Each structure stands twice: as structure tokens, then as C-alpha cells.
Amino acid sequence: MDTQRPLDALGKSINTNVTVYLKDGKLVKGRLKAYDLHMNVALENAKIESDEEKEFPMLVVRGDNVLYVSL
Amino acid sequence: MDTQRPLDALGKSINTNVTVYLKDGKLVKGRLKAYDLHMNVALENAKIESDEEKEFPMLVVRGDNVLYVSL
Amino acid sequence: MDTQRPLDALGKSINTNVTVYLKDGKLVKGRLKAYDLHMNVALENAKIESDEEKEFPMLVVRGDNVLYVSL
Amino acid sequence: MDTQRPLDALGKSINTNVTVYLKDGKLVKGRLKAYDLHMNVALENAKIESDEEKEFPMLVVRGDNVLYVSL
Amino acid sequence: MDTQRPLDALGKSINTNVTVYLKDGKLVKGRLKAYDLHMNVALENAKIEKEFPMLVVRGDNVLYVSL
Amino acid sequence: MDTQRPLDALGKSINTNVTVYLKDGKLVKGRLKAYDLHMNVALENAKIESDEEKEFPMLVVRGDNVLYVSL
Amino acid sequence: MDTQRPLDALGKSINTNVTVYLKDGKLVKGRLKAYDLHMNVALENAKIESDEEKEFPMLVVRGDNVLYVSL
């Protein structure tokens, strides 16, 4: 919420549920454990709206795939 | 304003609402809370005029997705 | 005018009326207020050849969307 | 597990079966042996689950193809 | 001319008419006024196969340039 | 086999045959003579399994085309 | 020849004819005059195996279009 570091908002959501929106249209929801200046994120217990059936204990998402993150 | 820092026009619009046009045709509307030189933006109470229904309390939009931004 | 700095041509055209060509076939017209070495540009009173009706008092285009800028 | 280094998840998973989802839609599962900050990965005995039969003793994946890696 | 520096060919062609080929199949021809290391070019009196008195082309759009 | 340098598995494969898959779908086999950190590779007597007919005494591939290299 | 600089095979082949394939399929062959670490190349008397009719006395190819170069 400092006016020059929009990614501070991901720091203020560490260990909360977030929803990462990818460019292809996928949605990955999970517990945000980490992020970096590329917008790579570590998501704990992640689920994709798409496949439903499968759950991912730990998922690491390459930041250049990212549309936006809903905090 | 300053002819060499165009991203300062975002400066003149912080804590107001702005429309962020993305490359994939999407239009994101939100309260502008932060921005860096990647054109990453933080939007408060965001709305995509695609789905229009849900307000997102906080969207962090990755910069390379931005087409142009309406201040 | 300088042979190694082509974007000086945009510095010569500040507050003149320019047309920005984007990769996706769009035409963004307006008053060039600012630019940077990424080819970001701030346009005052921007209109897009597509929408016709709506003008934009301030529009910041992200540079890697730019095909060429006409002066 | 540090909040500012999501790629450290990968280090905790050396010599462990991980699944590399690519932008293509391909799936590549194998034993993680090495990784860089580009998210290039070294994969011992990988198996693209599209072509199934092919055995890849050693596979090196270019990071910028990585959609996400499931640990 | 120098073997390590192919962009000097643009320099050897300043104020020469050239043709700039873009990835999308467009062609832009005109007078070469300036170029940089991203391969951004400025073109005088440019025309795409209207005429633009000055056309600044972003260098990552470039397929190749015809000298 | 060092955990932080997944491209070392390439160095351990010089003067040997390799298979470079390319994002466009091509498969390119040849003896690996040289590589760098962009993943540009030099191929000796290379063969595109699609083109079949043509052989290449020397092929250098630009890394940003690499999907993955099967050693 | 040198294991870390695949771009030296490009230096070994200057003032000879080479073929530059491009991501759009193009075959561009010509007399190699110069290259840089981006893999930009300047070719003398270049010919596209597509257009056939028109030869270019001097062509400068932006390296990010290169797929591979034959010798």
C-alpha cells in the first residue's frame, strides 16, 4: 500500500488465500507462501477451477504467466 | 507532465479510480493504490467490465499485460 | 536529429498532435505529453480510431504495444 | 519457506518427483536434479504424458516454457 | 563493415532510403534518420505499402531491414 | 549434477549426440559442440526429423526456441 | 570449437554463404558479413527461398527472428 511498491500487497497477503489469474484464462487459488519481483508465487494446497478433481500440495507459478492476483 | 517521465501521469491519479485496458480485450477498473516502473498496478475495489458483477477488494495487475491505462 | 537517438524525434514533437500505431491494429491519436526510452507515451485528449465517440483526457500507452508512432 | 523466495520450494524438492506443466499444455514429470533462477530445470528420467512411451534419462527444460511446477 | 557490429550497416546508410520489414508483414520505406541498439529507427517521409513526414518505428517489431 | 546449475548437464554432453525439441514442434538431433547461458547450442551434423532429407554440418540454435533438450 | 561460445561458429563462417531460417518459416541465405551477441546478422546478396525474384544487396536481420543458422 506504499504508492511505489504494488507488490507489497502480496507481502500483506502471505498465508492468506489468493487467486492467481493466468494469461491463458486459468485460475489458481491457494495459500500464498512467497513471491518475488518477477511475480513468481508459491501456492500451498492449490486448486484449478478447471480440472477440479486434483489438488496440488505445493505449486510454484512462473510470474510471466500472470494476468493478475486477487487478494 | 514532465516530458521524460510519462508514468508520472499515474502519479497524478493515485487514490482515484482508473481504467486499465489489457491486451486480451479485458478492461480493469479500480482505485489506484500503487504502481512501479514495470507498470505493475495495485487496484482497490476492482471491477472487470467483462464480468461486471464481482468487485475484487484488491487486484495486482502484472505490467506486461497492460495495453494502455486511462487516467 | 541525432543519428544514434531516434526517440529524440518524439522529444521534438511534445505538445503536437501524434498518432500511435499499436501491434493489434489500433490507432491512438492525441497530444504527446511525455515519453520514455521504453517508448511509453502519455497522450492528452486521446481518441482511438475504433471507439470514435469517447475521448480520453489522459492515456498512458505501454511501449511494447507500439508498432510505430507518426509525427 | 522464506516469504521472498518462492523458488526455494524447488530446492526443498531436489531428488523428488515433480511435475512441470508447460505453456504448451505438455506435462513433464521426473526427478528434479537442478534448477536456476530462470526456472530452467534438470529432470532425471522424465516422461511427457502426451507421448507416454518415450524414456528421457536426462531432460533440461527452458524456464520460459514453464507454466507451473507441482511438487 | 566490422564483423562484430552488424548495425553499423544502418549507420553506413543514414539519410539513405531503406525498407523496414516488420513481423506482421508490413513494409515501411523512407529516409533513415536515426537508429539505436534496440534497432529503433526514425524514418523521414515514410510510406507503408498517405505519407508520414516522420515515422518512429519500435525496434522489436523489425523482421529485417533492406539497405 | 550441481543443484543450482541445471545447464551443467549440457556441458557433460559435449561431443555427444543430443535431441533439441523446439517450441514449434521440430526435433533437431546432432552432436553437441557448444552452448551458452541463453541456451544457444551448436549442433554438428544435425538432422531435423521432420525434414529428413537435409543434413547440417553445422547448426547453431538460438536458445529462446528451445522447449527442452533430451540428452 | 569452443564449448561455451556457440556464436563462434558464426565467426568461423563470415564471408561465406549461410542460411538463416526464421520463426515464420523464412529461408534467408546470403553472404555473412557480421553478427552480434543478440544474433543479429548482416547478409550480402540475400535471397528468400519464398520471394525468389527479388535479391537484397544488404539485409540486416533482427536476431530474435532467428530459428537456427546453417554453418
GROMACS .gro file of C-alpha atoms in nm, chain C residues 1-65:
model
   65
  143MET     CA    1   1.801   1.478  -3.544
  144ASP     CA    2   2.085   1.294  -3.370
  145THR     CA    3   2.164   0.977  -3.563
  146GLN     CA    4   2.206   0.748  -3.259
  147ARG     CA    5   1.892   0.859  -3.067
  148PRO     CA    6   1.583   0.804  -3.284
  149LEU     CA    7   1.345   0.867  -2.996
  150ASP     CA    8   1.468   1.228  -2.992
  151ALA     CA    9   1.211   1.269  -3.272
  152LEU     CA   10   0.943   1.223  -3.007
  153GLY     CA   11   1.111   1.482  -2.786
  154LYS     CA   12   1.082   1.731  -3.073
  155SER     CA   13   0.705   1.667  -3.102
  156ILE     CA   14   0.590   1.730  -2.744
  157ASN     CA   15   0.252   1.908  -2.732
  158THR     CA   16   0.199   1.838  -3.104
  159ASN     CA   17  -0.066   1.601  -3.237
  160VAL     CA   18   0.057   1.245  -3.298
  161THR     CA   19  -0.083   0.905  -3.399
  162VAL     CA   20   0.031   0.590  -3.218
  163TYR     CA   21   0.007   0.260  -3.409
  164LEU     CA   22  -0.024  -0.048  -3.187
  165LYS     CA   23   0.053  -0.405  -3.286
  166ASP     CA   24  -0.311  -0.515  -3.263
  167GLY     CA   25  -0.420  -0.281  -3.545
  168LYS     CA   26  -0.536   0.008  -3.324
  169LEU     CA   27  -0.479   0.379  -3.388
  170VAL     CA   28  -0.433   0.602  -3.083
  171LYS     CA   29  -0.434   0.975  -3.159
  172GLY     CA   30  -0.367   1.266  -2.928
  173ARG     CA   31  -0.127   1.524  -2.791
  174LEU     CA   32   0.212   1.377  -2.696
  175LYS     CA   33   0.275   1.492  -2.337
  176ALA     CA   34   0.570   1.270  -2.240
  177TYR     CA   35   0.768   0.964  -2.342
  178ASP     CA   36   1.045   0.738  -2.212
  179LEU     CA   37   1.317   0.512  -2.354
  180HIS     CA   38   1.073   0.216  -2.330
  181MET     CA   39   0.857   0.410  -2.583
  182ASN     CA   40   0.582   0.455  -2.326
  183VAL     CA   41   0.388   0.769  -2.417
  184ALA     CA   42   0.141   0.990  -2.235
  185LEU     CA   43  -0.127   1.124  -2.471
  186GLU     CA   44  -0.353   1.417  -2.389
  187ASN     CA   45  -0.708   1.413  -2.529
  188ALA     CA   46  -0.671   1.066  -2.674
  189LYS     CA   47  -0.914   0.915  -2.922
  190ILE     CA   48  -0.898   0.566  -3.070
  191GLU     CA   49  -0.995   0.518  -3.435
  192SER     CA   50  -1.219   0.235  -3.309
  193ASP     CA   51  -1.444   0.393  -3.045
  194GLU     CA   52  -1.483   0.735  -3.214
  195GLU     CA   53  -1.728   0.866  -2.953
  196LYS     CA   54  -1.520   0.856  -2.634
  197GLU     CA   55  -1.220   1.085  -2.599
  198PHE     CA   56  -0.961   1.027  -2.327
  199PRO     CA   57  -0.819   1.336  -2.149
  200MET     CA   58  -0.517   1.131  -2.036
  201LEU     CA   59  -0.399   0.796  -2.173
  202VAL     CA   60  -0.067   0.624  -2.097
  203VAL     CA   61   0.028   0.361  -2.354
  204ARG     CA   62   0.274   0.089  -2.257
  205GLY     CA   63   0.563   0.097  -2.501
  206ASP     CA   64   0.597  -0.265  -2.601
  207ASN     CA   65   0.247  -0.238  -2.754
   0.00000   0.00000   0.00000
